[PDB]
From Swiss-Prot:
It comes from Homo sapiens (Human). Weakly expressed in testis, small intestine, spleen, thymus, peripheral blood leukocytes, prostate, ovary and colon. The modification Phosphothreonine is found at T219. Changing G183K: In a lung neuroendocrine carcinoma sample; somatic mutation; requires 2 nucleotide substitutions. The chain holds residues 332 to 676 of 947 of the full protein. This is Mitogen-activated protein kinase kinase kinase 14. It is linked to Immunodeficiency 112: An autosomal recessive, primary immunologic disorder characterized by variable abnormalities affecting lymphoid immunity, including hypogammaglobulinemia, lymphopenia or paradoxical lymphocytosis, and recurrent bacterial, viral, and fungal infections. Belongs to the protein kinase superfamily. STE Ser/Thr protein kinase family. MAP kinase kinase kinase subfamily.
Length: 336
């Protein structure tokens, strides 16, 4: 009766509003893309909610080509849609737009980040639907992804690795305390500011709003053992995946991939945690932090807050962030 009337009032219109309005409407989109395809009307449905004065609807409409447009080439591929730079034609403000087909759209894409006030989570500017297309609007982060920095740099020095992992665990701590599982923590889903000083989580395509059995695992190399074994999953899956991302930043390669072929699910269930992939040259507190994040039993695995403390303390132990922003190529680990 509360959500039922809110969505009835919001449907068929683009409005300026709050997170709860967008979130409520997003659930009806997730359900629509489950239904069988219908014949399209003359004028497409246009509905949704903009959360910033930077993106202004015009007579309750916000349509691509008319009110805003993408310019230049794509920022990349998210789990469920391509991402572009866009500009509101009225206000001139630029942002990022992810374009998701309705039949692959999960409301958790917006529920996980709508109205969250963390510097470690990419701000959501709103989302608008044009018939079978959901446009998700977010703050533009000029530095690109951590995943792209690792490809370009080969791998990162320990202090830079620790610094970004630290900022990611602050993000994960904020989410976990609000019963949100990210579900795809990897370097590709961390974005950097232009000076490389700020990191923020993006792409909540795999998010669940909580223990659960509905978790769609992302990248097989970053999956926690409890996921593979088809067991109950909590926030700890994100802690495991964050330490897989750490191994990736230090080594320049995903864990497992340089030692095993075929589907890795079996190997992740059967093998010891990939603690052997920890560089011998790493500081003791660094190795201890990754070891406690890569415990196979989730109950014994440290929390995002706990790993965050250890990682902050590991960064102090190596002298803090000294390494330069976009330094010289560092050769990734060779296969054996
Ligand atoms: C200038 O800004 C950006 C530049 C670049 C960039 O240089 N790309 C080059 C890299 C080399 O190949 C060609 C393209 C990337 C992101 C930017 N900013 C940005 N800002 C907000 C959100 C998002 C975003 C949201 N959800 C995402 C992603 C990104 C994915 C695709 C990131 O992997 C995954 N899901 N991204």
């Amino acid at each position: 009766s509360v959500e039922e009337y809110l969505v009835h009032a919001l449907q068929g219109s683009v409005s300026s509003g709050q997170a709860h309005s967008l979130t409520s409407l997003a659930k009806t989109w997730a359900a629509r893309g489950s239904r069988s395809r219908e014949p399209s009307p003359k004028t497409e449905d246009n509905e949704g909610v903009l959360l910033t004065e930077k993106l202004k609807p015009v007579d309750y409409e916000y349509r691509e080509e008319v009110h805003w447009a993408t310019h230049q080439l794509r920022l990349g591929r998210g789990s469920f849609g391509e991402v572009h730079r866009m500009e509101d034609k009225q206000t001139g403000f630029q942002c990022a737009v992810k374009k998701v087909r309705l039949e692959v759209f999960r409301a958790e894409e917006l529920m996980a980040c709508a109205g969250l006030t963390s510097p470690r989570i990419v701000p959501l500017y709103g989302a608008v639907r044009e018939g079978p297309w959901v446009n998700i609007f977010m703050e533009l982060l000029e530095g690109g992804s951590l995943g792209q920095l690792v490809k370009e740099q080969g791998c990162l020095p320990e202090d830079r690795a620790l610094y970004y992992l630290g900022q990611a665990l602050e993000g994960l701590e904020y989410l976990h305390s609000r019963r949100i599982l990210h579900g795809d923590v990897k370097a590709d889903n961390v974005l950097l500011s232009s000076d490389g000083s700020h990191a923020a989580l993006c792409d909540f395509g795999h998010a669940v709003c909580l223990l659960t059995g509905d978790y769609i695992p992302g990248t097989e190399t970053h999956m926690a053992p409890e996921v593979v074994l088809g067991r109950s999953c909590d926030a700890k899956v994100d802690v495991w995946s964050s330490c897989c991302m750490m191994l990736h930043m230090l080594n320049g390669c995903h864990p497992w991939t340089q030692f095993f072929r075929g589907p890795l699910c079996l190997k992740i269930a059967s093998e010891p945690p990939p603690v052997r992939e920890i560089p011998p040259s790493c500081a003791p507190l660094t190795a201890q932090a990754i070891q406690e994040g890569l415990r196979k039993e989730p109950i014994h695995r440290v929390s995002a807050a706990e790993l965050g403390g250890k990682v902050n303390r590991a960064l102090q132990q190596v002298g803090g962030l000294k390494s330069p922003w976009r330094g010289e190529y560092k050769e990734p680990r060779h296969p054996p």
